Amino acid sequence: VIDQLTIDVIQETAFDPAYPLFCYVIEAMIHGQEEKFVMNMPLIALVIQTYWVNSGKLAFVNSYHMVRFICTHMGNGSIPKEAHGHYRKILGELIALEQALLKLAGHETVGRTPITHLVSALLDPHLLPPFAYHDVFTDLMQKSSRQPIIKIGDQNYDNPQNRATFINLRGRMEDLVNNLVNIYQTRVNEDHDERHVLDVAPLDENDYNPVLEKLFYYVLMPVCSNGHMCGMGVDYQNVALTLTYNGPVFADVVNAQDDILLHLENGTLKDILQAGDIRPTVDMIRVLCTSFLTCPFVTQAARVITKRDPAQSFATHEYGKDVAQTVLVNGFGAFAVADRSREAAETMFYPVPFNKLYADPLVAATLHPLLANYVTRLPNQRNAVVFNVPSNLMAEYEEWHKSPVAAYAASCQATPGAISAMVSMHQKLSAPSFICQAKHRM
Amino acid sequence: TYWVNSGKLAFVNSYHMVRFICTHMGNGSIPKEAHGHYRKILGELIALEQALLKLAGHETVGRTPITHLVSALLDPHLLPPFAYHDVFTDLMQKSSRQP
Amino acid sequence: LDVAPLDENDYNPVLEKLFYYVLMPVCSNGHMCGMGVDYQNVALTLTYN
Amino acid sequence: MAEYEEWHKSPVAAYAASCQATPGAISAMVSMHQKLSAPSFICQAKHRM
Amino acid sequence: SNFKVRDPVIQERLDHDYAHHPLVARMNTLDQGNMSQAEYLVQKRHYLVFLIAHHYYEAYLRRMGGIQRRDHLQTLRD
Amino acid sequence: SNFKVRDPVIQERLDHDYAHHPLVARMNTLDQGNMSQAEYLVQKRHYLVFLIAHHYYEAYLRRMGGIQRRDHLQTLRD
Amino acid sequence: FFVHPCPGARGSYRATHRTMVGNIPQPLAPREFQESRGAQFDAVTNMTH
Amino acid sequence: FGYQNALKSICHPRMHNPTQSAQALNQAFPDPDGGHGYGLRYEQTPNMNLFRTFHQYYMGKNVAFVPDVAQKALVTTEDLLHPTSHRLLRLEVHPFFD
């Protein structure tokens, strides 16, 4: 379904010298929630329309959860139909890649574990999508025969009996209005460093889709952007200070629709909204003000550690039977932020480098001037493969994507034949994988 | 008024005007067809230095890298032919090749 | 000589060098010349209007 | 200007006055600014240039 | 600044400029405690953020209550 | 003309035509010195260029001061 | 190479390094070679124009 | 002669263990140089502050470390097998392991 006429929309947003930073702030306050998107549903219609009419590019490309909601919800003419035909091509093919993966790995099951979990790594559930908002962890603690250590800083995480003492379960915003006074007093009185409480919204089994989120983050995104993305740490207390402490947000007499540039101060909401041309109404930011009540506190980096597959138990170490990842709680991925409004960008967001495709020095130098001072100090580390991630985050001799996966995304064209190359790349090199390919004459 | 009257675009002389048109606006001031030809200049110059930093490599001779020593479009002792900022003192603090 | 102070987040001399030496002698086919300006004579046609 | 004590040394200026202003001529200037030294010949012989 | 993000540039003292507002009296209900005068005005600003958000969400639930039968069908008679 | 650029063609004597202006009295504050009468009117013209530029920039900083809270929110009551 | 005429009445030969591939003249590195050498720069980097 | 025919020996667990390949590699080269420990192992800290994971490593960082695997991925095909590169082929042993 995806043809080269719609990667050229997706690719050219990743190389924008002026990507709107205001829409990037809306993304931080849905944080993957279904009904908190319905709250801000008419706001992002004013964003996508005034970004598709101004330049020929669309917005909200980066995260999976925003793209899924624009396809399912907002089916009317709330956003331009020519721009709507590019979102339906994304998911309509990304389902079709998931139907092809189910056709290779046959109907047979080895033991209790099916063959589909053991042939392709994209269908392997122990692979997690690198950004997590709902509670994927206790779902994987429950149904894995392979032993899933979860390291949150110092402490481990083994029994799902202990899911209340490590992972704090939120709820949707309607029910939590009663407990909401005490929730705010956990943002101030508590020291969020060395806390090891991991604030994550609860998961429902029906709307959950693990494989489609991998095919977005690991296959479609690093090809189309040619591997120029980073993980974004945010502190939400600094972000909603700017939206709410604004003047006309706080004023009463102002009507329904009294577009903001009438009523301003010299704050950062000028230079965030000056650079995007967006003129929303004041009552619509007031809905983004309500997002602060259930904002999860700090972006945390959890580390999932799973034992290798039973076809791959043989190794040298005592840790060689055991292979880890990194999964961001409460964070998300970012393209190259504009060189316009970099000074307003430093007040909200900060760069943290991740798995392999998401440690990119062109993006991370934009976000903080210390790393921009690092890469321009010595230009060896400018490359996406060579660039050094802190050992407190990852060792790259462990994760499911080693170094030459990131070398492939940086050197591709945007051809749709290279989308199907990444899927054929995640074959698992095991011995009962070889039974599947040699049967189908691959 | 130079894109409507004739089908051409202005301010092509210096790099600083072209970098400031693309990054600062992103707007509906310049017409959309006329603004797309400015982004394709800065879209191309970044794609050239993504190529030039792959072939030169990563390894170093001593303290000085080899990206400063394989092509002359990356050796900072070549300077751009129009200086408006303090390019001269920036060179002397990061150079063994005595300027 | 008068110059402005430069910021380490602002300059990147590879892009300035891939512009004046690569893209401009090609697209203009080498019809370019350095131009000197008399700045107090430029604004005298503006402020004394 | 002196031609002999310079980086750009007239046979560069003869190429640009006779281009076709083709996207292959943009890449024919970038690979034309290639240091004709000994530790660049290592880098052109790895990639079979 | 090695442990926090950079603070944003916003004009100070929203209380002295507008209010005339009931929630600014609610700001004064927060006690100082051990925090200094510079530390108090920061956390008093954060507490104003919590009051504006709780106010507009309670107003939002009244807005999404939907139109009711008896009050609307009586006005259609006229 | 072998050391300077050609002088532009602009109508002379801006003082005699308009002012009625405070900065033209500031032009007279520049002293003649050793320069002749032909040399004085040239450098008096250049000094007018400096006064117009300093005037409009000081007016520009007042223009980009941005709208303030207390003066604007009081007028919204009416 | 060139001739350096300064001392006395006789000259002596001196030399400056060419520093680039483009400073090789057109009889020894022609226009159609620099085009087909920069198009080899394209096929190795796989840059997207 | 396909891969379905040759599947009857490739699937054996002698293709899939490194231990006897780490034995034979150790006996020829008796003591390797243990320096340059980048990317080998993870180390956990109690800090959840993702600035001090981000500042401390990049604060005064000078000459940077390039590992063995990121070295191989940028080399072309005939460039690797040339005999001027020992310590790439010395640790290329068999496809599954690294």
Of A213, A226, A4, A203, give the one whose Cα is nearest residue A91: A213
CA distance H76 to chain B (A): 11
Give yes or no for a contact between B19 and A344, defined as CB atoms under 8 angstroms apart: no
Of B51, A377, A185, E4, give the one whose Cα is nearest residue H60: A377
Breaks (C-N over 2.5 A) in chain E follow: none
CA distance A123 to A113: 13
Helix (H) or strand (E) holding G33: helix G31-45
Best of B53, B67, B71 to disrupt the D interface by mutation (most D CBs within 10 Å)? B71
CA distance D46 to H76: 7
From chain C, the residues in CB contact with B15 under 8 A are: 15-16, 19-20
The C-alpha angle F18, F21, F22, rounded to 5 degrees, equals: 160
Of E6, F49, F75, give the one whose Cα is nearest residue C46: F49
Give yes or no for a contact between E30 and E46, defined as CB atoms under 8 angstroms apart: no
Helix (H) or strand (E) holding F56: helix F37-63
How many angstroms from the chain centroid is the CA of residue G38? 15
Pairing of strands A230-234, A349-352: antiparallel
How many angstroms from the chain centroid is the CA of residue B2? 25
Best of H51, H56, H58 to disrupt the E interface by mutation (most E CBs within 10 Å)? H51
How many angstroms from the chain centroid is the CA of residue A346? 20
CA distance C29 to D20: 8
Task: Kindly provide the resolution of this structure in angstroms, with one decimal.
Answer: 3.7
Give the DSSP per-residue string, A157-193.
---GGGHHHHEEE---TTGGGSSHHHHHTTTTSS--T
Q: Report the DSSP beta bridge partners of residue B47.
A: none
3-state secondary structure of B61: coil
Buried b (16+ CB within 10 A) or exposed e, A87-116: bebbbebbeebbeebeebbeeeeeeeeebb
CA distance H74 to A380: 13
Helix (H) or strand (E) holding A150: strand A149-151
CA distance A88 to A70: 9
Give the DSSP per-residue string, A186-230.
TTTSS--TT---EEEB---TTT--HHHHHIIIIIIHHHHTTS--E
Helix (H) or strand (E) holding B54: helix B32-55
Closest CA in chain A for residue B41: A17
Two tokens at A391? 């050992």
Q: Which residue has the tokens 């030294």?
A: D37
Pairing of strands G2-4, A322-324: unpaired
Upper half-sphere CA count for residue A178 (Cβ side, 13 Å): 1
CA distance A367 to A351: 6
3-state DSSP of H51-88:
CCCCHHHHCCCCCCCCCHHHHHCCCCHHHHCCCCCHHH
CA distance E50 to A240: 10
Pairing of strands A327-329, A131-132: parallel
Q: Measuring CA to CA, how many Å separate C38 from each of A400, B14, C33, F52, H79?
A: 63, 18, 16, 19, 57
Backbone angles phi, psi at A38, to 5 degrees: -70, -30
Of A328, A388, A379, A324, give the one whose Cα is nearest residue A360: A388
The C-alpha angle H1, H4, H5, rounded to 5 degrees, equals: 50
Pairing of strands A198-200, A332-334: unpaired
Q: Measuring CA to CA, how many Å separate D48 from each of B69, D31, D41, D44, G43?
A: 19, 14, 10, 6, 11
Query: What's the burial of F18, exposed, middle or buried (CB within 10 Å: 0-12/13-18/19+)?
Result: exposed
Closest CA in chain C for residue F42: C44
G and F: touch, per 3+ CB pairs < 8 A?
Answer: no
Two tokens at G33? 């070679």
How many angstroms from the chain centroid is the CA of residue D34? 5
Q: What share of chain C is helix, strand, coil (3-state, %, to 5)?
A: 45, 0, 55
Greatest CA span in chain C, whole angstroms? 41
Strands (E), A318-433: 322-324, 327-329, 332-334, 349-352
From which experimental method does this structure derive? cryo-EM
From chain A, the residues in CB contact with C9 under 8 A are: 342, 369, 372
In eight-state DSSP terms, residue C20 is I
Positive or negative, the CA dihedral B36, B40, B41, B42 is positive
Best of C9, C11, C14 to disrupt the A interface by mutation (most A CBs within 10 Å)? C9
Kindly state whether A403 is in contact with chain H, defined as any CB-CB distance less than 8 angstroms.
Answer: yes
Q: Which residues contact A136 (CB under 8 A, 6 or more apart)?
A: A128, A129, A203, A210, A327
Q: Report the DSSP beta bridge partners of residue A230.
A: A334
Q: B71 and D7 in contact by Cβ < 8 A?
A: no
Upper half-sphere CA count for residue B61 (Cβ side, 13 Å): 12
CA distance A145 to A137: 14
Q: Which residue has the tokens 């650029």?
A: F5
In eight-state DSSP terms, residue C14 is H
Q: Measuring CA to CA, how many Å separate E12 from each of A348, E40, E45, F70?
A: 18, 14, 9, 12
Q: A247 and F77 in contact by Cβ < 8 A?
A: no
Helix (H) or strand (E) holding A362: helix A361-367
Two tokens at D2? 């002196």
Backbone angles phi, psi at B39, to 5 degrees: -70, -30
Q: Which residues contact B73 (CB under 8 A, 6 or more apart)?
A: B52, C14, C17, C18, C21, C22, D30, D33
A-G Cβ pairs (cutoff 8 Å, strict):
7
Helix (H) or strand (E) holding H20: helix H19-28
Q: How many CB atoms lie within 10 A of CB H39?
A: 22
Q: Which residues contact A73 (CB under 8 A, 6 or more apart)?
A: A37, A38, A41
Q: Which residue has the tokens 């279904």?
A: A34
In chain G, count H helices and then E strands: 1, 2
Upper half-sphere CA count for residue H9 (Cβ side, 13 Å): 3
Q: Is A184 left (phi over 0), alpha (psi -120 to 50) or beta?
A: alpha
Of A302, A295, A31, give the one whose Cα is nearest residue A141: A302
